[PDB]
């Protein structure tokens, strides 16, 4: 399905200020971008300009797996619950809103 | 007042004068008499022997966290024959 | 929000009351007693020896590892219910009277 | 109400020189950008041209529901009365240099 | 009356140096950033760049109460009389700087 | 279970109620005999003295370190008759 | 500044001395008995039960907690004077002197 | 004096080299900036440009009082006599290439 | 990789699995046991008691020094074999077990 | 040997992401920065884009000692025995696409 | 003489770890900070980043007393005679590649 | 370095040993008796009785004050020999005996 | 020196070798001696057992606390006849 | 093993079973002998009555710090008539 450029600012904002923020056991966005297949190298040069989830996403779209699935079903493996509820329309949303145009042709 | 935990830091260092530094006795039977039991004092007194910190301080402060009025704390300063502290904690009311 | 109640959200808590309900749980290693109640859904410890002993290392920089693991279990929306009914039934009345002064019985 | 163009020199760099300060936790361009219906890449692109507002109210300027009336109601909408505040003025005088002077030459 | 563009970098500078620093008892920019209503989440997604006092107003301007005003009753309402006296000739002064230029029209 | 280091906190908790504050001797002489030595016993003790850490704690979590089973400290709380300890870690299995 | 007087801000003090006149307060839970000393203008204890643990829990961390309350009861101006008077008053007589040799009887 | 361009490429480069390593405790390229009289919204633009140091001698290099005799008394008062013992050679040479070539060609 | 050998590059190790056996190392200055363990080929200390102090100075900040110091003689290609074999040597058998359970005996 | 011009973005990406990772006791780019005879200010407004090393090798390359056997005795000398191994190879071979090609004529 | 720019990272990092390190009775950094007279809070708002001896130098540089012997004759008065021994060499080094570079015209 | 002599420097050693002839110094108040016995050339004591409670403090954060005396008297070069030749005649034989087996005479 | 907690650490040292270990009543009634009160002087006895601090260090140093001198320790050194310390604080004048 | 120090922490735990809970002067004519001295033993002494701390662990590891050997504990085991002691440290050789 619908790739991450599927999902912007407003939701990607959103996702920032619950990923950004490390956590102790619950994850975090290094859990993810370790998910989403990066490297323990990758990953240190992103904990660098603020913002990394965000960075991670602009990062793992001219990628593979890169599904906006992808991301939310990582996200629930990842058992961040809290993310899924609150971005949840949000999303849904922003995919009515790219399917809905990217089409007349 | 109302509660321990809401003595005034000086009414609640007078007070762990009285009880801490007061006979190994007519302190730890005040203990036991707080609705505790064997293995809580346990800890509870092993704190004594740390750079000084109010056994009564703790002993107190923890029976603030489970909601101790201040009238349970003067009423049980006359029922344990320690007015000696009281004496303090009225100079308040 | 405002109206804190057993239905709300705990990672939605105003950050000036968890540094409140913070000094209750923070002393006497009330935390780890609260860390270890944290139980997941199966049943299993949420937490376990190793997570405990990283809150434990926050005390070296300061930060009331109270709320460090509030956030944190805060992540599985947990409803101030859930933190209250782990409260009292661990017995800390002071926090859980903070909270709400429902369920907080006397001795 | 009207075209873009209406706004002067002044206005169109003050407007910049507010939803410009990109901030992560309010509202600024982007946050705007996606409230006049900009997709993902779209945004990443004015984010390079210095100046995005100003970019954003020109790649703008001529589209379906772009009109002064919206950019208003826009910034209404995202609460940015920073600038309601402040621009309302040179506003509401600029849609009379476009419109007292729209009716003779 | 006039909003946060209104006092800069001086008076910005001076502001960080009173409300970053964390104390126990006394009103931190955390405080502070919850007076301005501010989520828990934001909150803590500010706490990460240095200067967060002055992120803080960056991120309080382009939204509804902003006044200098607001901010100087919400210094005081938080006691910080500190600051107050020791910035207040700077704002008032920063205040006849704003107010006396953008003024030839 | 299985290792020393996977016990549920809580677990490791009601048993480092014991140990801990359970006699200096009663204690002290398990410690020299969890295979230790007299300089390393020297510093796992001055631990005790600092704000509330289990010394068993930090003796259990050090043998922990060591790769140490469960089913070792039940049967080192056994031919030592610290029974009253090993009572807990029974009801787990 | 300079010139210590009993005119000049708390707040103001060289980071030296503080670290100073730290060593004078800090022993013996010696800001114990100042931290209650400080009171509002209302009369109230300034820093109450709960602010003093906060500060206790800054041994853990290696923080003069004379300064880390010095530092944070500055940001209310108090004279350099509302201090010695209130060591002075306190029988802190030693630290006070290096404040300012003026009030500091003798025994 | 005379009009910033006087200043050859050399020194607008250390110029830059020196005044834009920021540091929120003294006195960098926004201290500056703001003895020029520049307003804030006007300095957080110019913090985008990498190099804002010479940013700020263009955007300024045209304006009311600006000249080098201002930039140099400007870095007097701000005391960053870093600069002054080390493009003081460099400038009244580049004053004389300028002077001492304006009044044949 | 995926199947972690002592054959190949510790700087090339999953960044999920560090924070893990970091639980191990980082607690009571376990790395710190491990950082003067780590030697240059010469036989010289690696790392002296400055760069120590330097790696110590990462807990006001939050920083598994374990992974700091992992990383950062990680830059000398080191084998995750010379990591267990400085493991065992220096007693830390639970994480060196965590890495290859080949070479760790039983009490 | 010739100049960096030769290894092109594959492994400036890789190289980066090497370097561009501040260490306590091993070289960080600022480390080699230093080696390549750079001023400290110099240096340090080159803290700044993210992805120094390139901005280092950029740089360092219409200069002086720019050669790539230069870059690579200096990271052999860096004691940074990581990166010319992982990379070592992919170098020795954009020297040769470089070599034979662009020798046409 | 002449000023911090002098030396660069290679001192400066030696030189932090000498300083960063907080003592009882001799000097850590914030006892030099203070003989480079700065203002209490100027010091505790440099207590936050790591490496405060680095972003001392770089305040205390565009400003008045900034010298390299400065600090030099400072470090000797404070008795930390470690510093300049296991330092020395290494800096009357860093001052020659400036005064001998940097010296081409 | 690696072969310790009587004229290497104090700050210059491994902080593995270290943190081991720190459990020579460390029990029995035995860094204070070292302390003291710290003098300058002038001949006045080195730290006063009011450093000393400095170093006393460091016991509620849980640090070696053999360490943190040890390196910070490190800031003034002292050779190694110092320290035994100050070990020695204070009767701290078995830590000097660890640093160089030469002058360590029997009972 | 001048005051008491200008006292050099060693000279202080030997001094709390002295009063500190030295007869259960030849101290105490030189702290009681020392214009101090009951209340006082039952914290700083508390103190003497914990792990080693000189009662006399802590009764000195709070003396310290109030501007004492050093000819004020020297002289309730003999009007007390504990001449056995003084001997030390008199190899420095 | 070869230094007092270096015995097993076991064999000083049955060691200072003995000498520590074992006749005020059986023990003080030990220590006294151990080449000290009247000042020395007062504060090693004083360690006794605080929690639970061998006087003779103490005495042992102090006369540790000094490079005594453990042919030299064993001598003065029998050359006190202490054979009850050594009975242990020989189970060792």
Known sequence: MLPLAALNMRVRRRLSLFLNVRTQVAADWTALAEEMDFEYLEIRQLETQADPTGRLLDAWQGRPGASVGRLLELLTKLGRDDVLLELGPSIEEDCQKYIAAALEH | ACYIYQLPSWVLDDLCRNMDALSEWDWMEFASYVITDLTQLRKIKSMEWVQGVSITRELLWWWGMRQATVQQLVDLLCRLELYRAAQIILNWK | ?107
């Open chain 3, 1 to 107: 929000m405002g109206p804190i109640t057993p239905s709300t959200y705990v990672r939605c808590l105003n950050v000036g009351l968890i540094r409140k309900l913070s000094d209750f749980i923070d002393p006497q290693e009330g935390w780890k007693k609260l860390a270890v109640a944290i139980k997941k859904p199966s049943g299993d410890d949420r937490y376990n020896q190793f997570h405990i002993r990283r809150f434990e290392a926050l005390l070296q920089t300061g930060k009331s590892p109270t709320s460090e693991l509030l956030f944190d279990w805060g992540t599985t929306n947990c409803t101030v219910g859930d933190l209250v009914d782990l409260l009292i039934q661990n017995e800390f009345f002071a926090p859980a009277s903070l909270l709400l002064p429902d369920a907080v019985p006397l001795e």
